């Protein structure tokens, strides 16, 4: 168990242009496209990430190569917010690995904003910042998910995903 294998078991992986849960383009592993309702808006954005003429297909290398700079990405997100920092210097590595988790699904921004539960997680209040995890739209719109990245944070174990 690692961020990799965790998120690739969230997000699945597909090769060709899918509709992510609340209506957006996406492809590979997780990789949002765009927020716009073009597919055209969408391929082109694609053959653009690709650098080449993509149909709206990528190999799997393709998708990896993506993976690899969102996973990227966030980490290197999180270690430059000022609000992120410090919580995630504060955790132990199963628990980091689930606040990547975390901002990979859903913005540094995003999170940045999930005040509350930032502040009991520094202060390594697990229960509590569970609770106050599910209280989101996050939860309700991906409860299985979600459950499994709360119960990471909340235990400090890979249970969920064994
Ligand atoms: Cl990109
Ligand atoms: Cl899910």
């Known amino acids: 168990m690692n961020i990799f294998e965790m998120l690739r078991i969230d997000e699945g992986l597909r090769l060709k242009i899918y509709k992510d849960t609340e209506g957006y383009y996406t492809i590979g592993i997780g990789h949002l496209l765009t927020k716009s309702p073009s597919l055209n808006a ?3 954005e694609l053959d653009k990430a690709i650098g080449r003429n993509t149909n709206g297909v990528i190999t799997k290398d393709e998708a990896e190569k993506l993976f690899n700079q969102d996973v990227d990405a ?3 997100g999180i270690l430059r917010n000022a609000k992120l920092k410090p919580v995630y210097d504060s ?3 199963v628990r980091r690995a689930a606040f990547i988790n975390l901002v990979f ?3 540094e921004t995003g999170i940045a904003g999930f005040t509350n539960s930032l502040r009991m997680l520094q202060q390594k209040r697990w229960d509590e910042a569970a609770v106050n995890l ?3 739209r996050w939860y309700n719109q991906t409860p299985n998910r979600a459950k499994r990245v709360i119960t990471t944070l909340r235990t400090g174990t890979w249970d969920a995903y064994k």
């Open 105 to 107: 699904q859903m913005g």
């Open 134 to 136: 599910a209280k989101s």
């Open 91 to 93: 955790l132990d590595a």
């Open 74 to 76: 966030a980490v290197r």
């Open 42 to 44: 969408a391929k082109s």
